Symmetry: C2
Subunit: 302 residues, 2 copies
């Protein structure tokens, strides 16, 4: 297995599937993990494991030795505080190839309402926007900034990732909320959903094939929240969540005083397809069913 690729955050949903994709390609897999993390869930991949706390420049450098590449999986300041040492260590370890996993919320909304693409940038500080968007904009700026400064950083930006192995769960709380009768309503909104297994392969592909300093949207299905809500319901044998007005959402925010909860957009997958060879082939139902089954076997449904 002539090539060695590492993954930080391998126990998260999207990292676990990057790790798998590296194993599926027949590369040597390295997993850089914090000592507290339960990386033995990935022992089946026969990984090489390197311990490193993410604020420990001696240990990151050491964990980043002899790699052909690496995937990376008070709110703004400390987001930047975690990534900054990593980039530091990548420079010292002389890693040739770095992919940083970004978010589509680093991008503004397509100004004609069409599906979003990699060319959508905020000219400067996304002022007046949520702190979520701000944090996501910063991490995006930071990565490009390392590219500009001669670091080999590629940026891979998946849509909402859904699939099996979602421990929290995280993104798949939609599935469990619905299944457990909790999500009784939804708010209108556009969203791109992507199968976890694929998003992992897309990451590997950006890492091996992306242009340094470029973003690549890794997309699945463009979807109304009504329809994502409804399909999951139908599959779980449950009633469809009913729509809830946008005004009725702010009116609760206002009762509070005494959002980006449906601020997503559709994504254009062409760049990844033409440059990376990447695109989804999995039916959405197959993804939603595989997630559903994983959650059920592990008792996330009451």
């Amino acid at each position: 297995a002539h090539v060695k690729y590492a993954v930080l955050g391998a126990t998260g949903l999207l990292g676990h599937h990057a790790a798998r994709a590296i194993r599926a390609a027949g590369h040597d897999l390295v997993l850089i993990h914090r000592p507290s993390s339960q990386i033995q869930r990935l022992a089946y991949l026969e990984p090489e494991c390197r311990v490193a706390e993410m604020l420990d420049h001696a240990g990151l450098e050491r964990a980043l030795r002899g790699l052909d590449g690496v995937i990376f999986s008070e709110e703004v300041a400390s987001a930047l505080g975690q990534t900054n040492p990593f980039y530091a260590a990548c420079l010292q370890a002389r890693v040739p190839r770095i992919l940083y996993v970004g978010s589509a919320y680093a991008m503004p909304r397509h100004p004609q309402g069409l599906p979003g693409h990699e060319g959508l940038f905020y000219d400067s500080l996304p002022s007046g926007k949520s702190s979520y968007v701000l944090c996501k904009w910063a991490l995006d700026e930071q990565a490009r900034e390392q590219a500009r400064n001669g670091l080999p950083v590629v940026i891979g930006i998946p849509g909402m990732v859904l699939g099996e192995l979602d421990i929290g769960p995280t993104t798949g709380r939609v599935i469990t909320a619905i299944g457990n009768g909790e999500m009784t309503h939804y708010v209108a909104g556009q969203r791109n959903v992507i199968d976890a297994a694929e998003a992992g392969r897309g990451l590997l592909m950006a890492l091996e094939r992306g242009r340094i300093g470029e973003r690549y949207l890794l997309t699945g299905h463009n979807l109304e929240m009504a329809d994502l809500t409804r399909r999951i319901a139908e599959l779980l044998g449950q009633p469809a969540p009913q729509p809830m007005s946008m005004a009725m959402a702010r009116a609760l925010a206002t009762l509070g005083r005494l959002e980006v909860m449906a601020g997503g957009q559709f994504l254009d997958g062409r760049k990844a397809r033409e440059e990376l060879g990447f695109f989804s082939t999995t039916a959405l139902d197959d993804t939603l069913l595989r997630a559903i089954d994983w959650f059920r076997d592990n008792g996330y449904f009451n």
Copy 2:
């Protein structure tokens, strides 16, 4: 003016009206304030002002000298942290008569759904309830605990206080939210509303006349939130806020994850009436109009 009564928190809505009531009764008024507070808004009452930070036992003791009585106007721990020194200082200053301003949220809901009364107690820690209720239950327990231990504490519990001189505003954000088009919806609920001017007189009356260690509900009008919402709208020349389901409120709380906002009850005013001679005589519209006018003259409406 043979009797001297003091008020802490005189710049708040309910304290300002206690202060006024003390002036209206022809007593000598003392205002105990923190040095940062803008107590010169009450200079027209020709008050005697005593400076005291509320965590400064030397200064409270000194500010509590030679009084015939006093009205008192991480969330639980620090609520108790503010009151505890005050009670300490009342013991050393030998104040004969102390009224603590409580909340109706220290009481559980009438177990047959009738209007609530002073006999409603939680037998012990109000477990599983909101931290708001918990904090309000504690301060209530604390006051009774000082009574039990020989301190002359009376507890006065007004309903939702509405009227003029509401600086934040605080309770009157309902009025301004509606007026400014912000409160577009409300959640079903029962509530007791009381005129500010009166609630101040009720406080004075509890202080002079209550039994040591007893609670006294100071009540105005029992009101559906639909009707309070609607009257304020009609008076402001605005559309009535529309009802919003309770389920639709939790369904937003649940979208968040990826209350007591209508948990109030009606209050029974009989104890205050029979013992204190207290009861409301003011039409609700007159109260809502006086508040409305105060807010308007000071430019709280856009």
